[PDB]
Assembly symmetry: C3
Homo-oligomer: 221 residues x 3
């Protein structure tokens, strides 16, 4: 089917994706009400079940749900709507992996606003999305047509900080492979200082051109 075949090719296998999600488990260990927004193939739900974490996944796509319903708890719904259908101080944790980029930028404030209200204190929200602050990924953001406009890390940090969240931190992941990045220079005949400045320019070039392809913003309370 279209989207499975699509993700499989440009996102990677479920094993691959699940491997990447491992890093975020510490923020949900032993949680009882973790919401997986836009769960898709249910890679996070599978992980959760494995780590002994209770969670529900939501997804507007009917096929992602047929895909997860058998092993996991999922509700075919619009996230914002589903969030309104929830009591305040309900939710335990919230995972939003590669979802916001697929969301109408106009409704971004309301989503996180609802998350704050439906989350109980000392809870963590994790938002993982493609990094548009590096040319390489920015270019690749256009491969998926269902993508809206790139979602900048700073806009996410600003909104949820404004909403009340604290500890807001930004982490970058999946960097470009060696072959793609520019190479640094060495020499025992060329001026150390000429060498030094050229490499700093290459570090700057590598950061803005071939920087990490993803990022994750984490917040608490």
């Amino acid at each position: 089917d279209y989207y499975f075949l699509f993700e499989e090719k440009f996102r990677g296998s479920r094993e691959l994706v699940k491997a990447r999600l491992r890093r975020y488990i510490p923020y949900f260990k032993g949680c009882r009400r973790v919401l997986d927004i836009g769960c898709g193939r249910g890679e996070f739900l599978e992980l959760c079940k494995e780590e002994g974490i209770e969670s529900i996944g939501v997804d507007i796509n009917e096929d992602m749900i047929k895909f997860c319903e058998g092993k996991f708890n999922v509700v075919k719904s619009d996230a914002i709507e589903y969030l309104k259908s929830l009591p305040d101080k309900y939710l335990d944790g919230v995972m939003i992996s590669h979802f916001v980029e697929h969301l109408d930028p106009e409704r971004l404030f309301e989503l996180l606003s609802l998350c704050y209200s439906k989350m109980k204190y000392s809870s963590y929200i994790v938002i993982e999305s493609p990094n548009p602050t590096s040319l390489y990924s920015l270019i690749n953001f256009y491969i998926d047509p269902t993508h809206k406009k790139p979602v900048h890390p700073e806009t996410l940090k600003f909104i949820l900080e404004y909403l009340g969240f604290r500890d807001v931190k930004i982490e970058f992941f999946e960097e470009c492979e060696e072959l793609t990045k520019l190479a640094k220079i060495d020499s025992n005949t060329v001026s150390e200082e000429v060498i030094r400045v050229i490499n700093e320019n290459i570090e700057k070039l590598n950061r803005i051109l071939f920087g990490p392809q993803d990022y994750a913003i984490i917040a608490k309370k």
Copy 2:
């Protein structure tokens, strides 16, 4: 309140915005009917008052308007609606600062077309918007979720020339800080021919990656 805090953080303080607008005073010197489209926090209006320049601002934001009315002459209203309500050859000059990137693309032509019709002969029009022709700047263009498509300066120049405006000029401001830009190499030991070509390349790299963050297009009649 949201948008003030947002502007303060990403667009700068009022004092700063006001500072950067002094470059346009020569174009509205002694004018009495200047329209400030998307007046925002009123920085351009505050500048006009100090310069004895009469102007009125318009904005869709009731929050921005409430902030300005007790200070300057503003009117809550869509720009196109306001323009349409003016007689032709009425305005002394027009200022459009960081507005077009928020306007729906299909309404850009009309807006500008109306400016031409409602402007009297000899008047000046200034349009400042974030520069998308430089990477650093193109990335920051996505921080604001209310942004539409990046507005290229050549496209505006085309529209203006087409409407009958003349002496159209595109200038660029808000250069990137040397800390972020790549550095030119100074060297007494390496061949000048080689150093020269490396610095000319750094020059091209800096213009397309760390060039001016803003641009302004100025026209007349």
Copy 3:
């Protein structure tokens, strides 16, 4: 009107445009039923007329069709609609030059599936459009307000491979001029490998920043 002056200014002369599409002719030689989608100023029509290749053009623009009807066979209509009015396995070939970016993302798939149906075995389809994998050309992409999201070469390749086309090749054209790109270094006072590595860094830079401005995806069957 607007669009003629606009293309003339930003795309180039009919002469120039004609010169660029000339390389796709071998795919439609001897053909009698080629479909040129979004014929524009009929530069592809004109070429086929010169090669004994029979083809019809379609466009949604009144003025573009008006420009053509004199020397070429064209019809004013939505491309999706024209295709549906044809029998399956009818077309000798399909040319889509600088059109997919002017199209609603959610209709792209329909369009291509229709092309597949309406084409007969072993026919060629060529899709030429702006290349967004190079900074230079994606910046210029925003000059045209009517442009939607950029269309990445890989997305087009995935869609039609999905539909059943094979031998899908992605090619790139219209490199930037030597004066715009970064120049390479050559000297004999500097260590060979220092020069070799800086140059391959330049090669990587020129690729992602000043590379091909156009891409053509070619498929058969």
